[PDB]
Amino acid sequence: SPAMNEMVKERLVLGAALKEAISNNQLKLVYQPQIFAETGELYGIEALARWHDPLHGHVPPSRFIPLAEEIGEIENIGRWVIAEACRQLAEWRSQNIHIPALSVNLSALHFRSNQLPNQVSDAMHAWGIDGHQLTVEITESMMMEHDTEIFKRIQILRDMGVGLSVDDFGTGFSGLSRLVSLPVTEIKIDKSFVDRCLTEKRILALLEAITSIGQSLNLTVVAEGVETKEQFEMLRKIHCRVIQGYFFSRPLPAEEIPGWMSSVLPLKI
């Protein structure tokens, strides 16, 4: 009972603290560099929420994203992330060409079908983003027909230069056959797939098959969740194109990014 009283108490203070966080704009945006395996040069970065508060603390995204879902703040957060990212690109535009591409995981931000054509376009209009600078990532579950009228929404963005990426495959050839009929520009590999891909058998051949589709259709296969050297060796051997994980660099905040790109690049191993 007092555990129950503590859960309600704690999930009521943080809820009000989350509303205050978006009101005065406390939220941050930490980026994680993804580079080429053979070249070592930077391919792009991914914008991550990473809320930080003096009282509560580090408050991981996996614990406030569902929390923001019950209080209806997924639109306020989602719109903000894109808007802040474009603002950060504008701040970086006043230096040089800098960033090649910037990725945003819409699925992780719990994006509904109503936000796509506007929250991306309006951020590209308020700032000098040429469109061929940012890419979006969806869970493919939204890709299916339904009745949400989302197929033309992503096509609007794709005509502006915005890249597209999918994540969930469900470990199935049907998911691969449904993928080749999709207007994608890059393909991401789940962390669970990369995790212990050396142990299991088919999962290594599966990842080797995904990379085969990439070279044939000019798709950029993206590795996500690489930690050890052994994972890099096997992936590079099967031509994984690009890598993203703790093995290269832990996600860095908005600041120190130019200092990182000028000191460690090219990171060729």
From Swiss-Prot:
Q: Which domain of life is it from?
A: Bacteria
Explain what induces or represses this protein's expression.
Expressed in the late exponential growth phase and at higher levels in the stationary phase. A member of the dosCP operon. Expression is RpoS dependent and is higher at 28 degrees Celsius than at 37 degrees Celsius.
> Where do the EAL domain residues begin and end?
11-265
Q: What happens upon changing residue 56 to A?
A: Loss of cAMP PDE activity
Briefly, what is this protein's role?
Answer: Heme-based oxygen sensor protein displaying phosphodiesterase (PDE) activity toward c-di-GMP in response to oxygen availability. Involved in the modulation of intracellular c-di-GMP levels, in association with DosC which catalyzes the biosynthesis of c-di-GMP (diguanylate cyclase activity). Cyclic-di-GMP is a second messenger which controls cell surface-associated traits in bacteria. Has very poor PDE activity on cAMP but is not active with cGMP, bis(p-nitrophenyl) phosphate or p-nitrophenyl phosphate.
User: What further fact does the record state?
Assistant: Binds O(2) with a dissociation constant of about 74 uM.
Q: Per the record, what about its domains? A: The EAL domain (residues 532 to 799) is a cyclic dinucleotide di-GMP (c-di-GMP) PDE hydrolyzing c-di-GMP to 5'pGpG; it has no activity on cAMP. The heme-PAS domain (residues 1-139) forms homodimers.
**Subunit comment:** Homodimer; has been previously suggested to be a homotetramer based on size exclusion chromatography. Forms a complex with DosC.
Tell me the protein's name: Oxygen sensor protein DosP
What organism does the record attribute this protein to? Escherichia coli (strain K12)
Portion of the full sequence shown: 531 to 799 of 799
